[PDB]
Amino acid sequence: PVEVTYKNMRFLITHNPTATLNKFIEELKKYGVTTIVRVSEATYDTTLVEKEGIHVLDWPFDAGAPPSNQIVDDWLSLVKIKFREEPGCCIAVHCVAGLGRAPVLVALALIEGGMKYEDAVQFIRQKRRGAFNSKQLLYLEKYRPKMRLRF
Template sequence: MGSDTLVMIPPKSISPSSSTQLCQFIIPTSSLIQYGQMNFLITDRPNEQNMDTFIRELEYYGAKIIVRVCEQTYPIFPLTSHGISVINWEYPDGAPPPPDVIAKWIDLVKRTFKNLHSSLPINQEDNDCKNEGKLPACIAIHCVAGLGRAPVLVAIALMEAGVGYEETILTIRQKRRGAFNQRQLDFLKSYKSTGQLTSLALPLKVKPEKYCGIM
C-alpha cells in the first residue's frame, strides 16, 4: 500500500438504544424571548434524568410557571416541590393551537405580567434583573423539541402585544433556529390579533423612591 493511499474508516455506529440513553442526559436547550414587560423561556421537553438541571435553569430565570403543550412524559412533583406550577395544554404536534388554548394562554400572560410594578424592589431597574439572570416574572413553555407548538404560543403573545408577523417570526427564529413548520407559519400569517396584550408592550419602568425629609 502506497503512502498516498487514503483509507476510509467508517464512523462508529450508535445503536438506537444507546442513542436514546444518551439523549436522556442532554440538558434541555432554552431560549429567552423578551418583549416589553413579557419574558418567555422556550425549551425542549425535560425528562427524569435531567430534571434537576432543568429546574435550576427555570429558577435562574425566575420562571414559576411552565406550560406543557405536548404529551405528559415526566412527573411534575420535582417541579411543584420547587414552587413551579405546571399547566397542561396539550394539542396535536405540528398543528396550530385550538381557540380554547389560545384564550387560556392570553389570559395567563395577562395575569402573569400585569402586576410587575408592585413586585419589583424600589429603585431596581429591569436591566439589573436581566444581568443577574433572574427576571421579575417569566413563563416557561415547552413542547417536544421546542420548535413548534411552544414557539407558536409565544408568537401569538408577541402579536397580541402589537408585533407584526414578520418581526415576530424573525425575533423567535433568531433565538430558536428551525422554529415553525409551514402549517404553523400560515396560521400565524393569517392570525388576527385582538390587541389584548398591548398594555404589556412598553418596557417596565420602576418609579424611583420618593424622598421624604424633615425641613
C-alpha cells in the first residue's frame, strides 16, 4: 500500500490483495479513501466494499496499453471534483500488479497538477519502485496536458 500526495490530492496505489477483503476494507477506510478506481480485472466483490461506504468505479484498460481519452477525461474530472467536495480524502487506484495502469493515472493527475512528466515518474517511483514500463514512460513523455486544473 503506497500513498502519493501532491497539493490537494492524496492517492493510494494498491493491487489485488496479497490478505482478504476484511483487512483490505479496514485499511482503505483508515486511509480516508472514499473512492476506488479499478483499472484492471479485480479480485474482490464490490458489494461488501460499497456496504462499507466506498464507491467503486471500474475503468479498465489493457495492461501496458494507454488509457482511452474518455478514461483520462473522466479521471481528471473525478480528481477535480472529489478533492474539493471532500477535502483531505483519499482516492484509491487499483491495478492487478499496482505497477503500471494505476501509477499511470496518478502520473496524469500529477502532470495536470503542474509537474512535468519526468517529475511525476520520479515522484511515484519514490513511493513505488519499478513502476512504469518503457511503453508507459513513452506515453507519459508524449502526453500533452489540458492544463485545466486550478489550485
